[PDB]
Amino acid sequence: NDAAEVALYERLLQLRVLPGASDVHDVRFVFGDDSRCWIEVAMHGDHVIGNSHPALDPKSRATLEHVLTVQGDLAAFLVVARDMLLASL
Amino acid sequence: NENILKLKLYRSLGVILDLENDQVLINRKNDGNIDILPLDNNLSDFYKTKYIWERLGK
């Protein structure tokens, strides 16, 4: 069922989309990994919405941001985000 | 509803999950063409997913 695929989607992607509710549209990417790590950002609009919760140093939020705007390959971003979330452990 | 947005994300990574046979389908953007991976307990299914996903990045 739709819930069954969604379970395999999150269970194996260790990535969940948590929209921020309040008054402005916001997307919070959450990585399911004990330390619980997440970054706030969206491909829609952009505002002071700047929150980062990795588990090592700001360099992650830095290289991760420069990576998406510099590579233009959203694949190298989620792919490097995974390898980066691991290095934090 | 937003289900299409989530599938659009994983689909953007070049992954095409399919429960029509408990298997994950895949597409290699660089060189290669299409690839398939069956779901199995194996030793570390989590590592297998990080394997195709690391290669999909290329």
Look at phi and psi of residue B38 and say left if phi exceeds 0, alpha if psi is from -120 to 50, else beta: beta
How far is the C-alpha of A5 from the C-alpha of A23, rounded, in Å? 31
Residue of A78, A35, A38, A48 whose CA lies nearest to B13: A78
CATH node for B1-58: 3.30.160.430
**Which letter does DSSP use for residue A48 in this model?**
S
Give the amino acid at B48.
Answer: K
Beta strands in chain B (DSSP E): 15-18, 23-27, 34-38
Minimum-distance CB partner of B17 among A9, A76, A80: A9
Burial A33-46 (b: 16+ CB within 10 A, else e): eeeebbbebbeeee
Is residue B52 a contact partner of residue B26, using CB atoms and an 8 Å limit?
yes
Helix (H) / strand (E) element for B12: namely: helix B3-12
Say how many Å lie between the first and final Cα of chain A, rounded. 34
Please give the C-alpha separations between residue B19 and each of A1, A41, B47, in angstroms, as whole numbers: 9, 31, 20
Please determine, looking at this structure, whether the domain spanning A1-89 carries the CATH number 3.40.50.620. no
Residue of A2, A56, A24 whose CA lies nearest to B4: A2
CB A82 to CB B46 under 8 A? no
Is residue A89 a contact partner of residue A55, using CB atoms and an 8 Å limit?
yes
CA-CA-CA-CA torsion sign (B47, A79, A75, B30): negative
CB A75 to CB B50 under 8 A? no
**Which letter does DSSP use for residue B34 in this model?**
E
**Which letter does DSSP use for residue A89 in this model?**
-
- In terms of DSSP H, where are the helices of A1-89? 2-13, 59-71, 74-88
